[PDB]
Assembly symmetry: D2
């Protein structure tokens, strides 16, 4: 998270951290609980190469990384079959927890959007994670979950920005229909925030509008963060999650 601050313990009960086995169980990507047995994440966090499920653990909503880990094994990794790179798209994946979750008050599921929700510019939107706090700067210990409010920008407004300072022909779409743009030179997600939730408050309900995907660096001039547009992939998601 670039800009924004440390999150209150009550907010973002759906936030999860993904761990890879090493010298310690290290955070590498974010995620969200969308069902007591299912986590939504970014395909590039776990793909496109096939990886050992034993090497992976999920940690549910924690205020600081590592302090009180209760790591959770994973039974299935479902990566969207159109995915190969985040720029080509379909950067979305599903993890099946080995057991459904103890759904309390501090941890519970985020609500998915109706297929009809567009999230027009001006909607109140927040992204959260334990990623870098600027380009090439790790989040310092004790690793607090951070949050930032990011301004949404229309895909076409955003697409044109991406052509500023670029050789890429104007007729060539950089920001694709299954994507969504948000953030500015002061508010953004970054490396390590990947696969994490972008949530907007619509009529009093938090809906996950996006999954953190990619971008040209973090909070760079004319390079807003790019998210997987969740609505776009609702059918593929409901095919697997109850």
């Amino acid at each position: 998270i670039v800009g924004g601050q440390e999150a209150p313990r009550s907010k973002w009960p759906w936030q999860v951290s993904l761990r890879v086995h090493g010298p310690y169980w290290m955070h590498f990507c974010g995620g969200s609980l969308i069902h007591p047995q299912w986590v939504l994440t970014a395909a590039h966090c776990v793909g496109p190469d096939v990886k050992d499920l034993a090497a992976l653990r999920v940690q549910l909503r924690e205020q600081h990384l590592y302090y009180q880990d209760q790591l959770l094994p994973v039974s299935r990794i479902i990566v969207h079959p159109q995915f190969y790179t985040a720029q080509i798209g379909a950067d979305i994946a599903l993890l099946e927890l080995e057991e459904p979750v103890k759904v309390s008050s501090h941890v519970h599921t985020v609500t998915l959007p109706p297929a009809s929700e567009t999230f027009p510019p001006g909607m109140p939107c927040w992204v959260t994670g334990w990623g870098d706090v600027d380009n090439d700067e790790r989040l310092p210990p004790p690793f607090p979950l951070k949050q930032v409010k990011v301004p949404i920008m229309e895909n076409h407004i955003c697409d044109a920005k991406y052509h500023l300072g670029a050789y890429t022909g104007d007729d060539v779409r950089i920001v694709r229909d299954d994507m969504l743009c948000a953030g500015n030179t002061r508010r953004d997600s970054c490396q390590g925030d990947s696969g994490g939730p972008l949530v907007c408050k619509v009529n009093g309900t938090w809906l996950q509008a996006g999954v953190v995907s990619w971008g040209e660096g973090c909070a760079q001039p004319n390079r807003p963060g790019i998210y997987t547009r969740v609505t776009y992939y609702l059918d593929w998601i409901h095919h697997y999650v109850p």
Copy 2:
């Protein structure tokens, strides 16, 4: 270059090194002389972000990098407008030198393929450059130019290799029609070879079949090197080069 050895002094008169300004004029990509005033290279060497011409130099064939240079300024940089990433395609660019070079037998142009050459599986193909000699292993001093013979692998055969150990649907194609596969687990190109030539002898003529473009690591099981297929951009090229 992975595998392969130092190139003899006579071989590869069309090889060049691209140099970015810094504490010294550091090699970052390969390239080739295709006309006395034009250099062929990879788009991702010089894009998609727009570069400062003043910070770029061309160095014609040297046996050893940095020992002594005769850096040549560039007057234009043409990046294929379709390019955004190497995986999407169109990984190709042209550098116009500020002055034409005076060609000799130690430094002259490479011949481009006829507008329909095929390059079947097998076939004598060589790739050269000053890039890494393995995954995360720099070419050591005195930085000799390296060559390696690499077997072409048919596009369809190669695309199927690329789906092994991958989540990506067999209907989704990773190796595109503007791309070409070469190399194996012992013989391959690597970081810093990007933009350099893949050449094949055809009826006693060296033709440039490919530009070093990308791959999944270097010399990795079932992940041959990927090249921009030159034949596919002949028309584009000839719009700019006499």
Copy 3:
């Protein structure tokens, strides 16, 4: 700490952590609480070059670095005037807390040894700290205070071992009278432990035999850890500390 084990929450209430101001208040050395307003550490941690008090903080006994930080400012740094490098000796310094500590049960001073105690081989000694767990191998998150039981080795024998495999003349003393040796190839202190306490259990009471000073790497053959011999500088310490 090489080898050993995470310290139990009720042990070593005199352990302190030294923090330097940066992107976060980072641990760089240990120290011990020997008086409610004084902390004992190594000179090489804070010298020989004079530093700014403002950029230094002290953290009292914590089970996990950084998590419940309550940084304490210091009003004075006193460094033994005979100190230039760890090898030459006099590697010992004092920090005056700006304010005295409210001695809890989880936080109290350690006892200094009487001038008469030489800590023979065979004594139950521990060294504790948050340093590296091996040569060039950081303590992983969440940074549990570690402890290791270390075998004391007599100076003359230790000094002789330091000559094994070295060019240095047997007549040249490497291990001085104001130093003390402890540890083997499975048990040792390391980088990040400097300044912390070596304590021994004598006649019911914990005495601080040593301050973590230097060595040739950590847990290397014929290279035991070197500590500053506390008894050697009692006068100096008592000049400042009631």
Copy 4:
């Protein structure tokens, strides 16, 4: 070499480079040819720990590191038995070449000073080497041999300077009688220059005054470069070198 400039090809024919075995024969220290079969260098380049002769080779006067290497094996390494660290002193060592050198106009010996030469301030002195061009800043390729003229300083003044902004007692010696100081905030030796020569032109003859030994950083205020004072070890040297 900090400050300064590339050396002419005809200058300093006694300068050598020391190489350690690895992925390539990498420069790690300078030295100087004092006899057709003997190299003079710093002890901290080869000790205090004893190492494999096989792992070491010597390169004679060469303009650019690595370009036309003719590496010479070494038959014997003799380190001064008083050496333990540079700060303690006796930072001097001799390498015996396996076979004598064919001296010429481009490679020959430097002359050792008489016992009575103090090298007072005002003498014209140079240091040469392939070391860092500033703190944390490698000599860039093609790795030219460098030189810098450095002002000599008297010992008592050098010693006192080193106490400026240090905790060390004014009466505790930092710069010993076997050392010699030269340099300022603009001209100095650095990491990788170690062991190479410092020469002064006395009565029309170049003499070796010192051996690059140590210092606090490079070209830091009040921290001139510190050299092993060659006259001090003349008897030791003459015990091995005809």
